[PDB]
Design a binder for this molecule. Structure first.
Ligand SMILES: *Cc1oc(C(=O)O)cc(=O)c1O
Ligand SMILES: *Cc1oc(C(=O)O)cc(=O)c1O
Lengths: 254, 252
């Protein structure tokens, strides 16, 4: 069977996919303003994309925001994510600081999950994952491809590697070059879900063409889907309110 | 550059998929009541599933419903469909009457489209298609598999055959036995759409597992999607419409 991943009072891997919405504010004021817009909406998890925070290199200022943020969102599960430049992020930092940041923040007891990138390598991952687990923090190990959709077996191989590395929630995001690529991502998702996964997984096909992948998790297997805070697309994004409506519509269809 | 299909003021094959809702009333009063709920609603096309009509074997009573129905939906495109028993319908009728019914209703000038089944055979199809076209009525040629999802290539072969038989709108509905079957239906749809189609097509994967196929037609290539008026595997048409516009705006 499979393990479920409990964060706060939310059970990832059970029922309807959970909706996660990111906070991308550049400063403390904007982050809190974003948080207040999300604290009482129908969403499941809030992600703090800390790589947008201008003072991310100062651990003390990062902690200060985290304290305040925690106080406003109460018991909503919080995912901490520093997305590196190579995988779409906003700020260059060292490998050593990436490790320190994630460890120090996991140590606060204020974050429920952290996102660590597969591409950082086994040394970094082993250190950050083991420490997060010591602090009862759940781990998403993520990988992105912004130019293509790897073959089904490649996608499955990466998700399996993420399980082997101790990810509580393997995550993969790929870019379709055509409509068939969106279907490959969905095919890989379900094969993993059905045959290889012993825990919940997170997958998406990016761009406008890949949006179906954000809607059909309950059927194909993605356990978490990401909505945008605002009601304006990138495009390829869906505002979280509208995403909630679609997920409920599909949950009730069966 | 690909042909669109124009019915009244609705352009099928352009922009978001068009929403079609069936009326399944067993009698005239019930059919009218249903039409009254759909007339000022957010949908594009109304389908009359005439096989549910108890007096379907009386062409004069079928026409009577049609004249009354048109006083309520004068400008909404109307699709006329007698779904046969072999393809999930309610009423057994002869092959001759199936042909007669579709011809006399096409001749009234009061329906914008009719739906005839591919597996009725070329003789029946050729006669009905030819006559419908002389009256400027659009024809959906449909095919259903309630037990399984044929292989991608067989789905494409059927959609191609429908085009060869003069369908204005090829239509296929298949039943998934697993999640991959839903992807097979979507893959066949886009393959047909991009490589072999010279007109709009309509496709769907049935049941709760295939519901996603009713929502993503703009990306994959289905030009019409069917909502329910009031059942697992069906989506109320009211919701269907917000979703389609939401997805139309999210395109690159
Ligand atoms: C988590 C996650 O989500 C998206 C998205 O577009 O919603 C993209 C992405 O790269 C990522 O890591
Ligand atoms: C047109 C059409 O729609 C459905 C549906 O489930 O909406 C099924 C079906 O057999 C058909 O012909």
């Amino acid at each position: 069977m499979k393990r479920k991943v409990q964060v706060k009072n939310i059970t990832i891997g059970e029922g309807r996919p959970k909706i996660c919405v990111p906070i991308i504010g550049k400063n403390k004021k904007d982050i809190i303003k974003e948080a207040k817009e999300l604290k009482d909406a129908c969403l499941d998890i809030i992600e703090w994309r800390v790589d947008f925070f201008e003072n991310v290199e100062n651990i003390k200022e990062v902690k200060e925001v985290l304290y305040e943020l925690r106080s406003y969102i109460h018991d909503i599960p919080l995912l901490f994510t520093f997305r590196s430049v190579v995988e779409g992020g906003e700020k260059l930092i060292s490998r050593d600081y990436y490790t320190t940041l994630n460890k120090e923040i996991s140590n606060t007891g204020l974050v429920d999950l952290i996102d660590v990138e597969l591409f950082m390598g086994d040394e970094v991952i082993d250190e950050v994952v083991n420490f997060a687990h010591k602090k009862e923090v759940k781990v998403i190990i993520s990988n992105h491809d912004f130019n293509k959709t790897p073959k089904k077996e490649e996608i499955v191989s990466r998700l399996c590697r993420m399980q082997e590395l101790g990810a509580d929630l393997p995550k993969i995001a790929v870019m379709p070059q055509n409509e068939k690529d969106v279907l490959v991502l969905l095919e890989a998702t379900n094969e993993m879900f059905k045959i290889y996964a012993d825990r919940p997984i997170i997958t998406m096909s990016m761009s406008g063409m890949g949006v179906i992948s954000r809607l059909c998790g309950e059927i194909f297997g993605s356990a978490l889907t990401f909505g945008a805070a605002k009601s304006v697309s990138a495009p390829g994004q869906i505002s979280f309110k509208e995403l909630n409506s679609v997920l409920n519509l599909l949950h009730k269809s069966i």
